[PDB]
DNA sequence: GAGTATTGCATAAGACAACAGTGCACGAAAGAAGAAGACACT
DNA sequence: AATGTTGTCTTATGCAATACTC
DNA sequence: CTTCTTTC
DNA sequence: AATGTTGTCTTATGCAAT
DNA sequence: CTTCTTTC
DNA sequence: AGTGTCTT
């Protein structure tokens, strides 16, 4: 059956569950077939990424334009948020330039200070000469991201969901619909951000501005298990930060921090 | 606290969890407060109940072009799938006409036999004079789709990932990658139906030449409640048909026949 | 009945037995009408090839009939080659499954190693002999006067008196096994497809075992439906029906 | 939208509450234009309202009209409950005539439970008993002009007259209707007093007659948290339900948890 | 449920749809009851688009002229009767079926004298109706014959029909027609064309745009399992869309 | 009074999203409406 | 050089407190 | 006889 | 008029031999 | 001192 | 000296 199996795959490339059945063989025999197989692994996952976010605020920053034609003529969006504190900093631009840049970064440094690093896209604007000397005057490092994946951009993209879901409700609430008064375009962007900092986050236990000057930092975490590349779960870690999607771990041997998917951390012990 | 928390969230939109810890105010009556804000419509009712099958062979077919440049210069693909046999049938054209359908239903006809009805989208061909005064000579009901959200052929969509992988699994397999020969191209469909067709479909307990030609028809079905519009589960159906997605479902006062999502159904008693 | 009859067999020159239960009309009406018209499993499989000049550029038929169900396969071509019958071949393994053996002619495009090759990857059986033999190739001859007398007869049917264009020719051949392959042939009171697949309609479904409260497995079961989380079971004797948990089932041999 | 409504009363001599839809006017300005309008203050009026449906009695009479000559006889039967007029010109008032009037008017309302006429000759005669008894309709006859089995008709015969005589007479008919244009301007008529809203309702008297198309119906929990009578409910999706407001068919959504049968 | 039917159909040969529907009985009787009898491309909207076209019956002599006009969507028909063949015959028959089912938008005709004259160019454009004079428009005049030979032939007129008779007869077939059946459909005219009208307003919704976004000012006049018709508050399109593409408006 | 249906309420339990500068660009196919020359109108 | 995000959306259980039905 | 339009 | 679908895909659980 | 390649 | 539908 086995060798019968492997000439019938080879010709018709039938999946594993009609040649275990077909010719009697077992399940993982039958996979077995498939995986050996060059062409018929089309499809494995191979998966993995995290943000990441950092251990405290004013450490990871995240900036990217977006564009909601509300604020016209000013349209341009710049939004910057910190990994931690998860809190939003935005201001209005007409032209994608790195004088924004620098002058939207001003403005976010001037709310909630001085961060250590700012991770941003491969846009023109970030990669220009005048931005990397500006950051370099500030003492602030940079950090590039995938040339057309955003997902590293993750959570400052999510952010924009709430700037552009929330300008629009404000924006309805007050009667625009089109475009938003010049005058009135100020008023709306200041209790837009003003929503979002003082007030939860949605089942989020503190306010971002809290946890932005009231930061929750552990000084020696709890012992966790990694599952580690070959599938093993590894004791000899301990968490120090665990959200919703990822997990910060820290090995007791060396210090080092590393993040992790939430499902390959478990409780040791 | 009603009216406060109504003042705060007319004004800054605030989310429920905020404005019921902030207020002091129970889940449900912040949830309200959410719910009835026109501006923060969630909304987010839309009625997931979307039965695209039908009951015995020879009764439904689904028909739909799609490209698959490996067979050109006649690489357009005409497929016809038997709603309830799971059959699939594709012939090769170089361009989609009417006299195209007519050839391709002419031939999945010859196979499987005059269906009942066809239900494909509504394209150049299909509400063509032309086609339909075909159809009448043969007497199979036609219905068309949605002008732009064909979510309804889906099940022949979904069976073209079925189609052209199996078309490219065998066609690297013979050492043709970016065009197969027109030498081998009809071996090559005629190898890729036979391996669908006549092989189990991964968990099918039976082959769609089984499901085809030896259906399973029930006479009267297992008592099983719907759960109706206002959530209630009432009792006095009978199921007919229980797969991974939708269920068939016959009431049992009228005989009457309805198709119903899966997770809609439960065992009566 | 008579009207409707008459109009079958003009479009598709269906035999006397199918008109006459298709219509319910009585055996010797039916005959009549085909009279007054002018025109008018899988163990051992016969091919062979015949030309037929009104299907132009690609004249070239290739036929093959099961000797048991009677079943009718064609494929054109525009040459013999020994491809073309490892193409065929294919074709009708893909039609109605693969056979045990086939029985040709002594020709080369039949007896070449590509072709030997070929029946030797699928293991189909193969026997050449004398090109027209009685054992023998007589059934398969008798095939292809009955395709193409269906092809020409078809055709001036529709209005193509010797040339076919390439457009409708692959139409041409489907009518053709449509009529060929699911209505009564003669005086035959089954179908082809019926000899060759046995449509028997299952009333119920296969037999499985539920697993009872001392534990037990116990036989006489069949299912019929298997939702989530539940299966519904149905005993054979009484036509009791009840529900129990998809653990508690398993195949019954 | 002042001068459109006010053409276009002039022409078919629309009632004020289709004008004020129809070209969006307040009714107190809809109300002034008819009132400004001498043969809109004749006037007369049809509607002056039980608890049956459409189809349930009806109402048939003959009347005078010499201005339709030859066919002077206007055969007029209008509806109880929907208030719908249907008309046909004759010669004379024959049986066989009231046979076609009815058939007209089956045609078009469909077939009521029954009729009630007078006491008139061709209502009592043989032709039209084997023809009521082919359709199936009941009937009554009556005293010829009492204050309860003959009401409304009354009053609708001066409503066709009086509206044919007003549509032909902006046209430059005054002392005699040529023939040609007779059943166009009874037609003209009908469209006119049929299609449109008339007198003050919540649904045209055409909609009044095909709504047996509705809710249960339901309450709903109100802000003070009362529950208010007068809504149904027409889909009850997931999580939300829209409902009706009976009085004026609009129509909101609402949280499932805030509705529960009414009675 | 056989007696009914079968009564029925001996005085009106009434279609099987209808009988079913009337006496509760399946299609295959009320269809063998039809077969036993002797004598016997879908559109959007209603008062959109009409097709009238004359046709001739010499029983009807001495105004042997007819005239239907059908209304394609809703699948009504509407007929009348005249001696010549001039304009003020046509202007008569559309003033009367607009009485008969509401102003249309534009009617397609065919290729006359009488569709084209200066009076009727300039009539439809006084009611504002489209002229286009524009395969399927002739099936309603058979329609109307064969119901006329069958009514006919039910009360016992053969010959040619007397002047004071013919009428009656026309609308026995007129509401012959459009009350019963169109033969194979599942709903009666009536409500084809009637009762989509009658709904006041349907609830808000918002429809999913091809570029994702949801759009306010839509109304839903249907809604089926698995679809809805939705008209536009500020132009009165009616789309249909996947339920999956709908939520509610506020 | 005592058993019980039901209301109040709180998580949790699967999920659904859309965030990525704008999406419209082109093409075939089948069917319907607008435009230039010709021979009647007057 | 440099990784996918949470903010909500409905319904499904487990336990106090009215409002009922004997 | 061109474009123009609705779908795939 | 006319309804998001399944075949793989990985890593976790119940019946029988060294 | 204009015209391409990158990315958003 | 003015235009107008029909053919395509
Ligand atoms: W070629
Ligand atoms: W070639
Ligand atoms: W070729
Ligand atoms: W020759
Ligand atoms: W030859
Ligand atoms: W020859
Ligand atoms: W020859
Ligand atoms: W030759
Ligand atoms: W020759
Ligand atoms: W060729
Ligand atoms: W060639
Ligand atoms: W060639
Ligand atoms: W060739
Ligand atoms: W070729
Ligand atoms: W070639
Ligand atoms: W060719
Ligand atoms: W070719
Ligand atoms: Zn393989
Ligand atoms: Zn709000
Ligand atoms: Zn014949
Ligand atoms: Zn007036
Ligand atoms: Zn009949």
Known sequence: PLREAKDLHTALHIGPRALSKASNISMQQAREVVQTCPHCNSAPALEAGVNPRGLGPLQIWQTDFTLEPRMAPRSWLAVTVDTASSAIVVTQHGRV??????????????????????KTDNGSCFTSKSTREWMARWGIAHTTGIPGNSQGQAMVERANRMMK?????????????????????????????????????????????????????????????????????????????????????????????????????????
């Not at 001037?110 to 961060?115: S, T």
């Not at 779960?233 to 910060?248: D, M």
């Open 165 to 269: 879901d929330k300008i629009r409700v404000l924006a309805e609430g007050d009667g625009f619909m089109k475009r938003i008064p010049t005058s009135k375009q100020g008023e709306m962007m200041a209790k837009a951000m003003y929503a979002l900092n003082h007030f939860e986050r949605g089942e989020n236990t503190k306010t971002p501005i809290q946890k932005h000057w009231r930061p929750t930092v552990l000084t020696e975490g709890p012992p966790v298990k990694i599952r580690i590349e070959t599938g093993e779960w590894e004791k000899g870690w301990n968490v120090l930060v665990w959200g919703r999607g990822y997990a910060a771990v820290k090995n007791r041997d060396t210090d080092k921090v590393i993040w992790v998917p939430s499902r390959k951390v478990k409780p040791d012990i």
């Open 97 to 118: 330039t790195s004088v924004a840049v620098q002058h939207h970064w001003a403005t976010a440094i001037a709310v909630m200070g001085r961060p250590k690093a700012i």
